[PDB]
Structure 1
């Protein structure tokens, strides 16, 4: 009778596709965790043992790429009791995230990159796709092999390096150390096929983006490799961010900060400013700590950041700021996919991974496909970690 199960065919039809481009109502044939066909009216019987999903009435779009998640945990600013746990596969998929880039933070003493690489590989095995950034806030960077350059070049899941500047938790790095680091990651990327990016944690420091502008003057690293995150933390910074974006740089906006500049507000304000969307990205900063400080560097409150804020922003964009479901999706999909050169991600077209999300017209996640495997059903995850 013949068996074609290994192929795992899947016909997702009758959905209003946003790839993100508004592609009207059309189908998507998925086989081997890959999108093998996108057109309207793919014959229900074009292939054997195919599984058809009557998505008629729902919306289909690419999964999310969260390039800022503390996969193994974070916090620690207020003692050992403030060490946030690790993230569970479920609260990721269940949040529309299919691709994620993990990093460390303030704590590099009781958090090592070697155990971040692990979770990263775990999260891969279990379904989604993960990558990590070497080092953390501390500069010189605390690596895995002893060289930012060597790390990015040889450890497969390392695509860049992270550091922290203009914050009272920085190691007070100087132009040189900052520049050297930034360059090792670029070349590392060149050798290993990684993006070679340098993510910069930003702080409420008066100096703002000064270190970056300075670093540009002290080396030759392409501005297209310098990513300032958390840019929405304070007004004077966000405005310099735009100016940085106007010179050709990409800026990462954290959706876990609701004031003084909302994520939704932030993104819109950038478009109106004239920045294209391909230079704007939204990160979550999952499982990270939300600590606040007064004027003497005293910590007052502290908590944890969740992922719910990604979709919210997207919703608050379509409504309120009169965007298109399409443009509103870009900052979490095609934009991020282009900045970190992630292939098979960000766009729905023949050849890329079946990282798909099924939502109601009102933008409520109902189903989440990750590289083909069904991860979320009816709004609740149907595939959890290994020890959840």
Structure 2
């Protein structure tokens, strides 16, 4: 016998594949964590030491990419006890997440980019794929190297910058500050080969997207680099978002937000609005707090987001909204990889990474592969974080 085990040959057989594109019943061959073949009827013997998997009667689709996650924990709006814990690997995989983008939020005093960066690396080490955004709510941005432009250019895992606008928790940034920060991210991205995006956490202020427009008049950053998130938090806001996307911008809907615009609802409206799913993304905001402010900007209620709403959103869309499974997945798969330029992610194509989900026809997660590795079986993590308990 000759040993060919180093290749990790895996053949996933008989599933109804959504690439996301519906490819009907198709096969997928994997080696060294990469998809090396996609076709109907692949020879179970085509390669030595192959692990064959019968997925007949099952759905096969790309892993989710969650671009809004408080990896190291977040919160703190109601003081120190409200600091949320760090994210555990198993909570992501089990939710279908195989690629994630970490960021900071309100607190950047007890929360640091260097911490966020080490955690990002831990996750890659443990099997999934992770990147981060530098900055936080605070503007100017608190960086690792002292320059937003520098952080994006030279820190491998940094792909852009985060900020807070139209929020009672913002730093009251002016347009110069915003423009310069976005322009730096843009430039850093070209030098480092990163998307160089600027993510705007939106609050409830009446000004809504104004600041974005102003920015656009005060710089030459492409609209394709600006990403407003939580767009469903309020009506008027959601509405402007739709125009923004119509003008070519992309928009990020938060699945952990149920009122006033539900996630599935929002997506559907965007389409009806004539916006292409490619310019619509869905993110969780997992591990952040769900702070609720009153009339006088006083906190009242505070909770913590999880990742289940992701799948739930997809299910809904299909179930109650006439969406095709294909269509329903885009906002968590190719639209994201497409916006962030995540090479090798969000699509099942030869040459892409083996980040795959195995589900039941009714859309329930059964298996999860990360870079070709089995992470979840029977809806249960079989691979956990070094200290997961």
**TM superposition score category, shorter chain reference:** over 0.9
Q: CA RMSD in A?
A: 0.3
Equivalent-residue separation in structure 2 for 1:277 and 1:54 (angstroms): 32
Residue deviations 1:31-59, cap 9 Å, x none? 00000000000000000000000100000
Residue deviations 1:248-291, cap 9 Å, x none? 00000000010100000000000000000000000000000000
Equivalent-residue separation in structure 1 for 2:216 and 2:79 (angstroms): 36
Deviation of 1:373 (Å): 0.8
Deviation of 1:335 (Å): 0.2
Deviation of 1:319 (Å): 1.1
Residue deviations 1:135-156, cap 9 Å, x none? 1000000000000000000000
Equivalent-residue separation in structure 2 for 1:194 and 1:122 (angstroms): 20
Equivalent-residue separation in structure 1 for 2:163 and 2:127 (angstroms): 29
Matches within 5 A, 1:341-360: 341-360=341-360
Equivalent-residue separation in structure 1 for 2:28 and 2:225 (angstroms): 34
Deviation of 1:166 (Å): 0.2
3-state SS of paired residue (1:362): coil
Equivalent-residue separation in structure 1 for 2:163 and 2:136 (angstroms): 5
Equivalent-residue separation in structure 1 for 2:246 and 2:54 (angstroms): 44
Equivalent-residue separation in structure 1 for 2:121 and 2:194 (angstroms): 16
3-state SS of paired residue (2:304): coil
Name structure 1 gaps, 5 residues minimum. none
Equivalent-residue separation in structure 1 for 2:127 and 2:287 (angstroms): 20
Equivalent-residue separation in structure 2 for 1:245 and 1:8 (angstroms): 42
Matched pairs, number: 388
Equivalent-residue separation in structure 2 for 1:373 and 1:364 (angstroms): 19
Matches within 5 A, 1:1-388: 1-388=1-388
Name structure 2 gaps, 5 residues minimum. none
3-state SS of paired residue (1:338): helix
3-state SS of paired residue (1:198): strand
Deviation of 1:23 (Å): 0.2
Residue deviations 1:75-122, cap 9 Å, x none? 000000000000000000000000000000000000000000000000
Equivalent-residue separation in structure 1 for 2:373 and 2:35 (angstroms): 13
Deviation of 1:332 (Å): 0.1
Equivalent-residue separation in structure 1 for 2:91 and 2:154 (angstroms): 30
3-state SS of paired residue (1:319): helix
3-state SS of paired residue (1:303): strand
Equivalent-residue separation in structure 1 for 2:210 and 2:183 (angstroms): 18
Equivalent-residue separation in structure 1 for 2:89 and 2:306 (angstroms): 13
> Structure 1 length normalisation: TM-score?
1.00
Residue deviations 1:314-368, cap 9 Å, x none? 0000011110000000000000000000000010010000000000000000000
